């Protein structure tokens, strides 16, 4: 599924996302942005062998099963085919987790890289949250 914008952005709210650990809504819908263009099927093959899924591009080395990452883990306990479905709860949940983790929204190097420090507000603009 592709998101719409202030879609996500409700769905991201709905789900509990909205300032948790203290990051707004418009920097996770930034995140998804860059990460994945809202798309949920998004996956990406990581030069490690790993491989990231979903909308917020969630990697196979830490947090979800692929079978075919080896030495990983699974701390969010789930197979990794679960991040890419229209239905954004996998995804969210397991977000949560990873940022948590110590290093915050730096986990995903594409918001460090391409939202933090910009106008995330702008991302939640006109959206009926
Ligand atoms: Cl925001
Ligand atoms: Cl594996
Ligand atoms: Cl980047």
Same mark, same amino acid.
């Given at each position: 599924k592709v998101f719409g914008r202030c879609e996500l952005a409700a769905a991201m709210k709905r789900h509990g996302l909205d300032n948790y650990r203290g990051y707004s809504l418009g920097n996770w819908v930034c995140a998804a942005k860059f990460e994945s263009n809202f798309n949920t099927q998004a996956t990406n093959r990581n030069t490690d062998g790993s491989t990231d899924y979903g909308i917020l591009q &969630?990697? %196979? !080395? /830490? /947090? +979800?099963? *692929?079978? !075919?990452? @080896?030495?990983? !883990?699974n701390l969010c306990n &789930? @197979? +990794?085919?679960? #991040? #890419?479905? %229209? *239905? &954004?709860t996998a995804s969210v949940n397991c977000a949560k987790k990873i940022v948590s983790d110590g290093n915050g929204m730096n986990a995903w190097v594409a918001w460090r890289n391409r939202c933090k420090g910009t106008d995330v507000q702008a991302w939640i603009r006109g959206c009926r949250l």
């Open positions: &969630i990697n %196979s !080395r /830490w /947090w +979800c099963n *692929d079978g !075919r990452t @080896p030495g990983s !883990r &789930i @197979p +990794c085919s679960a #991040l #890419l479905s %229209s *239905d &954004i």
